[model samples]
Target: AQYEDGKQYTTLEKPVAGAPQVLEFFSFFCPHCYQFEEVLHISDNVKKKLPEGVKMTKYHVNFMGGDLGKDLTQAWAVAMALGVEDKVTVPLFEGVQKTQTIRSASDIRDVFINAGIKGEEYDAAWNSFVVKSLVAQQEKAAADVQLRGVPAMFVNGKYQLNPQGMDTSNMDVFVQQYADTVKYLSEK
Candidate 1:
């Protein structure tokens, strides 16, 4: 899928030209988004269950503060630009969630370095035009979506799923329902 000019977010393989697309809106610093990571990882399975032509893409939103958030966002954009997204995204997430280390730009860079990505390479990629533009795009997307918290998801660029906006007792059900909705919409 082609990116909208000015938007730094990457599109996964596009859905069949006219097919509806599913975009999962989330952030790394969000505890809830971390909680939902298991479900998110099931995306490949979910996609397998989807009909031909449907597509799924994830957009990582960054609206929090501290050097950590900025660094994580920057690293994400850099990975995307370097075509190392699959290599770095999950490690970065684990660094924030699993470990007790403070999340800072330098901390994130260390994580990348530990993952075998060179410091200079990471810096170069982080400063690339696409990465910088993507950072700005994420800010715009967060504002446009009117996000108040993490783990919010969007479908077809319109429908939004906010955990806080729904009944807490049925969060899983709602998430599943949303997934089902995406499946149904894609096949239409």
Candidate 2:
């Protein structure tokens, strides 16, 4: 038996065509999502194993933490636009979810500053049309999926990954399986 359609994955209503891509739906405020990134290392592992030309895009949802969630999304867009995601993603996540230290946009900027980004650079990206365009696409993707919860992943903008039956007893095995599935789906 192969991965079942309804059980292992669900076809999306609006399939993103042309490129083989993985869209990750998550929120900085989600504890499970934080673990999915930092603990399980799903994104890193899956990314490493993806076929050439297959790209993964992270979409931060605004449904959590209300206005603060949207603020963080903007901060994330800036980080992505500036190519500083590797430096700031974890700090931002920990600031919002673990330490709960971020009280305003300035706090978000501090995370970027601590990552060696100049404040002016951050502000410039924050106000750039490119960053605004990215945030708009991300927000729209969040709404289009009608997501119930996050840490959700889709392959080719169509197949929704379901980890329900996958082995979770071992970290390496789990990530390997997940990465393998993503590689397989990327070709579909």
Candidate 3:
């Protein structure tokens, strides 16, 4: 099977030609997001196995529009801007999803520092013009997606895949299902 029903995954109104993009809409506060990250590992082995001409992007969501959503949205923009998302992604997810220690930017700074980022670098990444530009867009990106919940998957632009909603329970199954769905759409 190359795809699921439209009722299951919303199709994008306009998809641009380029490598099919598999974007993951996540949140630091969500326990499921943490589990998803934990199972996927997102290791080089798994990433390398992804279908050719496809790439993944992560977005922090604003569930119904609110606080932690606002904070981490910018924080992650910094992580992505400075090209350290891989280094700090899991730690941030673990921090909030596991320890519940992160509530705002100051706390996130400490988390990054703890993850081997020097204070100077952390400040630069968070304060630099590049990060500021990225941060400005983060808000619009999160708001533009019509995501009903966290850990939402958007493949090739607008197809939303809720594996569990489709009865694909188990995280491993969900991850595989996600990739399968992305591959299917890219071919389409």
lDDT of each: 0.61, 0.83, 0.68
Compared with the true structure, what per-residue lDDT tens digits does model 2 show for residues 84-187? 88898799889988898988989988999999999889999999999999899888777767677888998876888887757889878877877888877787
Ranking of all predicted structures according to lDDT, beginning with the best and ending with the worst:
2, 3, 1
Better of 1 and 2 by TM-score: 2
Candidate structures ordered by TM-score, highest first: 2, 3, 1
Which residue segments of model 1 deviate by more than 4 Å? 1-20, 39-42, 162-178
For model 2 the local lDDT of residue 39 reads 89
- For candidate 1, lDDT tens digit of each residue in 1-188? 22221231212233223323565566677776676774445355446666767667666665665666776777777776776766766676677777746456778778778878888888888778878897876666666556666665555654544334333466566555445544544544
Clashing residue pairs found in predicted model 3: none
Candidate 3 local lDDT, residue 105: 77
Clash number for model 3?
0
| TM-score of candidate 2 relative to the true fold | 0.92
**Model 2 spans with C-alpha error above 4 angstroms:** 18-20
lDDT of 3 by residue, 1-188 (tens): 33556744667565434413666777777777776677665333235556766566777766632777777877788788767888888888777767878877798888888878889888877778887777766555555655568777666665766555454456566566566555665556
